[PDB]
Design an enzyme around this catalytic site. Structure first.
Site, PDB file in Angstrom:
ATOM      1  N   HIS A 164       0.780  -1.218  -0.119  1.00 18.34           N
ATOM      2  CA  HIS A 164       0.189   0.050  -0.151  1.00 18.34           C
ATOM      3  C   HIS A 164       0.849   1.047   0.164  1.00 18.34           C
ATOM      4  O   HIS A 164       0.265   2.381  -0.237  1.00 18.34           O
ATOM      5  CB  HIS A 164      -0.930   0.043   1.327  1.00 18.34           C
ATOM      6  CG  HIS A 164      -2.373  -0.714   1.127  1.00 18.34           C
ATOM      7  ND1 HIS A 164      -3.199  -0.394   1.143  1.00 18.34           N
ATOM      8  CD2 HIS A 164      -2.451  -2.229   0.672  1.00 18.34           C
ATOM      9  CE1 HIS A 164      -4.241  -1.318   0.951  1.00 18.34           C
ATOM     10  NE2 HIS A 164      -3.438  -2.547   0.807  1.00 18.34           N
ATOM     11  N   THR A 217       3.374   6.470  -4.399  1.00 20.50           N
ATOM     12  CA  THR A 217       4.595   6.796  -4.716  1.00 20.50           C
ATOM     13  C   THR A 217       5.445   5.730  -4.438  1.00 20.50           C
ATOM     14  O   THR A 217       5.567   4.979  -3.234  1.00 20.50           O
ATOM     15  CB  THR A 217       5.077   7.907  -3.689  1.00 20.50           C
ATOM     16  OG1 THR A 217       5.042   7.546  -2.379  1.00 20.50           O
ATOM     17  CG2 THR A 217       4.165   8.964  -3.898  1.00 20.50           C
ATOM     18  N   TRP A 219       8.620   5.799  -3.540  1.00 22.87           N
ATOM     19  CA  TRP A 219       9.431   5.932  -2.359  1.00 22.87           C
ATOM     20  C   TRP A 219       8.938   5.335  -1.452  1.00 22.87           C
ATOM     21  O   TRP A 219       7.715   4.989  -1.203  1.00 22.87           O
ATOM     22  CB  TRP A 219       9.564   7.402  -2.109  1.00 22.87           C
ATOM     23  CG  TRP A 219      10.377   8.215  -3.104  1.00 22.87           C
ATOM     24  CD1 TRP A 219       9.794   9.288  -3.649  1.00 22.87           C
ATOM     25  CD2 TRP A 219      11.753   8.236  -3.760  1.00 22.87           C
ATOM     26  NE1 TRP A 219      10.678  10.083  -4.739  1.00 22.87           N
ATOM     27  CE2 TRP A 219      11.992   9.017  -4.503  1.00 22.87           C
ATOM     28  CE3 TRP A 219      12.648   7.199  -3.265  1.00 22.87           C
ATOM     29  CZ2 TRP A 219      13.141   9.442  -5.393  1.00 22.87           C
ATOM     30  CZ3 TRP A 219      13.969   7.346  -4.086  1.00 22.87           C
ATOM     31  CH2 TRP A 219      14.178   8.442  -4.857  1.00 22.87           C
ATOM     32  N   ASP A 221       7.954   5.933   1.701  1.00 21.23           N
ATOM     33  CA  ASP A 221       7.746   7.276   2.544  1.00 21.23           C
ATOM     34  C   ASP A 221       6.302   7.342   3.178  1.00 21.23           C
ATOM     35  O   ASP A 221       6.065   8.134   3.590  1.00 21.23           O
ATOM     36  CB  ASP A 221       7.669   8.246   1.206  1.00 21.23           C
ATOM     37  CG  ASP A 221       6.351   8.055   0.278  1.00 21.23           C
ATOM     38  OD1 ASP A 221       5.597   6.995   0.441  1.00 21.23           O
ATOM     39  OD2 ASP A 221       6.188   8.791  -0.622  1.00 21.23           O
TER      40      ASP A 221
HETATM   41 CA   LIG Z   1       5.113   5.304  -1.245  1.00 23.99          CA
END
Ligand SMILES: [Ca+2]
Ligand code: HEM
Ligand SMILES: CCCCCCCCCO[C@@H]1O[C@H](CO)[C@@H](O)[C@H](O)[C@H]1O
Ligand SMILES: [Ca+2]
Ligand SMILES: [Ca+2]
Ligand SMILES: [Ca+2]
Ligand SMILES: [Ca+2]
Ligand SMILES: [Ca+2]
Ligand SMILES: [Ca+2]
Ligand SMILES: [Ca+2]
Ligand SMILES: [Cl-]
Ligand SMILES: [Cl-]
Ligand SMILES: [Cl-]
Length: 640
Positions: A164, A217, A219, A221
């Site tokens: 996710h 994204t 990344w 993050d």
């Molecule tokens: Ca991400």
């Protein structure tokens, strides 16, 4: 020259390389040809996973280097943009822009998926063999197979929680329909089903002419709790003290007017993922409390930015040194995964003396500059395929009686079995509201995941209601097992044997090379009409005989090997900007003192693991017996 003579010798030694690697070989440097000779030599003798740990690690270092050089393929024009100053963006941006100091759009929402293996056009074979036949005969769960005590339902929730954050493919508006052939229709929960075509976006290049876009994204993050753009970030922010939305009373997620959970990404989610979202919102909010106390001059936006850096690094650390070590439960991978974070020299050395300067000795974390090996960061089409692990899910969740006195090894009795259908999506949020965070977490800790083997794919996933990206239900149900087969083909990911060749692994010649299960061999032979070249990637990855201790195939592992390292080393916030200026002193300390999921659970639920967890890791089955430590030094251990 000596280089020409050595190249001629390299052309001589080509006689010791598998013929299927002659192409990739010509593309290699002189030193890398020698390295391939060595890697391939080991593959034909005592394989790396049977070597003493220090030699296994040496092999993996060399193989990983080869994949970094030859298995990273850019897709599409690099979204460079105008030059910017990275010091102007000392935080994780809402859509992942401005991380790569040289390319504004790299790693951002809607960027192209890259590749590890050259694409194989399969548009004429999307239905060959039929994907519902493959799903029925090879995937659908016959008898449940579990992972012993190695990898519990918290670990299965965790990897979905990472998906996710990482990867989801942009869809087109065009509908596709798959129909169950007469031969298997009576064993298909859906006689036909509809879904959306993957969006194929032209690249403008010759070698790879179209690509997919990632609506998460790529990344690492924590966009699973923060969203992948400004709009979805705004939905989770309270705008007080840097914090995110959560129920103070229950420790569960809040829900919108339609009963849908409010978090970063809730697409095709379930209660186990909601539990981890809530836990890490509590983690983020706890970091806000710590930073606001330290400094009363920090406003909401400042608090949010620092707390997102800390929380996302804690998650990455836990995944690297705790979750992955349970997935890959061998001495070599304990050493290897810890080395990604802390280096071969180890945590004590790093914490005392700082980073040694090379990724090998000090870890990729804290390196002076991010490293992309000359290919802009992305998560890839191939990465998506190897993380298709739906067979980890059980048929039912085993809810335990947490009011009972724990028995030997802190065991608890079953109080109720809950169908997974009652725990997914909107219905799952309602079910979880009655169960509560503690009962769900403890029950998940005590329950084994499904194994990644053939004929172990939950039948409930063969008729599920899928979601739009916002978690809203679609009217058209899907058979997920058949759909996964279709997607890998649709997106031109090589099928199993070509995938192996592309990753310089020796291809199979017969089913017996893949598995010792004689009845499975017969099914494979039937479905694929004897042709190992038509064997689907997902089927091969589930079928492949496992290395002792590994929950995944070796073929999947080599993609994990390179791409897990890449998620850390390519990101400024794990490298050049992993420091006290960026994180704050207290923030960096928070990351540097958190080593496991257990540490985070203990922070928010101080008595839970003392009462109910007997395992060392919160990702192992919690009522595991105690284990005595191996007295042989880690780097010297020989696999049996
Ligand atoms: Ca991400
Ligand atoms: C209740 C739990 C889950 C549900 C309902 C679910 C359902 C789905 C659905 C509907 C899709 C999209 C199919 C499509 O249109 O292409 C999908 C994709 C995917 N799922 Fe799951 N899944 C669940 C758990 C998991 C788990 C445990 C994993 C393990 C790693 C996982 C990994 C993936 C991956 C890698 C994709 C591909 C994403 C992409 O195409 O970019 N899922 N899942
Ligand atoms: C990049 C490659 C890095 C590792 C290469 C290791 C070479 C294999 C060493 O063989 C040695 O002799 C034994 C025979 O009994 C082996 O089987 C044993 O395990 C090992 O100690
Ligand atoms: Ca509405
Ligand atoms: Ca101050
Ligand atoms: Ca009882
Ligand atoms: Ca038990
Ligand atoms: Ca048979
Ligand atoms: Ca500590
Ligand atoms: Ca206590
Ligand atoms: Cl949006
Ligand atoms: Cl990983
Ligand atoms: Cl650290």
């Amino acid at each position: 020259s000596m280089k020409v003579i050595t190249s001629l010798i390299s052309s001589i030694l080509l006689k010791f390389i598998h013929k299927d690697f002659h192409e990739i070989y010509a593309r290699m440097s002189l030193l890398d040809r020698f390295l391939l000779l060595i890697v391939h030599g080991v593959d034909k003798m005592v394989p790396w996973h049977k070597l003493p740990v220090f030699l296994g690690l040496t092999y993996l270092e060399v193989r990983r280097h080869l994949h970094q050089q030859y298995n990273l393929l850019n897709v599409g024009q690099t979204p460079t943009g105008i030059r910017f100053d990275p010091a102007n963006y000392p935080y994780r941006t809402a859509d992942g822009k401005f991380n790569d100091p040289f390319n504004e759009g790299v790693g951002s929402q809607n960027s192209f998926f890259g590749r590890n293996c050259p694409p194989v056009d399969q548009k004429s074979k999307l239905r060959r063999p039929d994907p519902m036949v493959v799903a029925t005969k090879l995937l659908g769960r016959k008898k449940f197979i579990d992972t012993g005590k190695q990898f519990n339902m918290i670990a299965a929730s965790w990897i979905q929680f990472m998906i996710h954050d990482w990867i989801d493919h942009l869809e087109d508006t065009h509908q596709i329909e798959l129909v169950a052939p007469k031969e298997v229709a009576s064993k298909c929960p859906l006689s036909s089903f509809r879904f959306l075509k993957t969006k194929e976006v032209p690249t403008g290049f010759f070698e790879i002419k179209t690509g997919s876009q990632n609506i998460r994204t790529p990344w690492w993050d924590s966009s699973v709790i923060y969203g992948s753009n400004s709009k979805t970030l705004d939905r989770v922010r309270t705008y007080k003290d840097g914090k995110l939305k959560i129920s103070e009373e229950t420790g569960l997620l809040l829900h919108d007017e339609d009963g849908l959970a409010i978090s970063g990404d809730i697409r095709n989610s379930w209660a186990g993922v909601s539990a981890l979202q809530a836990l890490f919102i509590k983690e983020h909010n706890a970091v806000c409390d710590a930073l606001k106390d330290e400094d009363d001059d920090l406003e909401d936006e400042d608090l949010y930015r620092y707390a997102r850096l800390v929380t996302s690094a804690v998650v990455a650390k836990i995944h690297t040194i705790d979750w992955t070590v349970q997935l890959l439960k061998t001495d070599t991978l304990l050493a290897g995964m810890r080395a990604n974070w802390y280096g071969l020299l180890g945590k004590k050395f790093k914490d005392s003396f700082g980073h040694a300067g090379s990724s090998i000795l000090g870890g990729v974390v804290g390196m002076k500059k991010p490293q992309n090996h000359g290919v802009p960061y992305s998560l890839t089409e191939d990465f998506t395929s190897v993380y298709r692990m739906h067979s980890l899910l059980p048929d039912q969740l085993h809810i335990l009686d947490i009011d009972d006195v724990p028995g030997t090894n802190k065991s608890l009795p079953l109080i109720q079995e809950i169908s997974m259908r009652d725990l997914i999506g909107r219905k799952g949020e309602e079910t979880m509201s009655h169960i509560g965070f503690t009962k769900l977490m403890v029950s998940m800790g005590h329950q084994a995941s499904g194994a990644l083997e053939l004929m172990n794919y939950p039948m409930w996933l063969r008729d599920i209601v899928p979601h739009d990206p916002n978690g809203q239900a679609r009217p058209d149900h899907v058979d997920l097992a058949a759909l996964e087969i279709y997607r890998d083909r649709e997106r031109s990911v090589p099928r199993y044997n070509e995938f192996r060749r592309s990753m310089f692994m020796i291809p199979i010649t017969k089913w017996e090379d893949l598995t010792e299960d004689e009845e499975a061999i017969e099914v494979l032979d039937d479905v694929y009409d004897g042709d190992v070249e038509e064997l689907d990637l997902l089927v091969g990855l589930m079928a492949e005989k496992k290395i002792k201790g590994f929950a995944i195939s070796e073929t999947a592992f080599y993609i994990f090997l390179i791409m897990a390292t890449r998620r850390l080393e390519a990101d400024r916030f794990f490298t050049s900007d992993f420091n006290e200026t960026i994180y704050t002193k207290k923030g960096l300390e928070w990351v540097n003192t958190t080593e496991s999921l257990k540490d985070v659970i203990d922070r928010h639920y101080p008595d839970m693991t003392d009462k109910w967890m007997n395992s060392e890791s919160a990702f192992s089955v919690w009522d595991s017996p105690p284990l005595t430590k191996n007295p042989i030094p880690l780097y010297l251990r020989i696999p049996s």
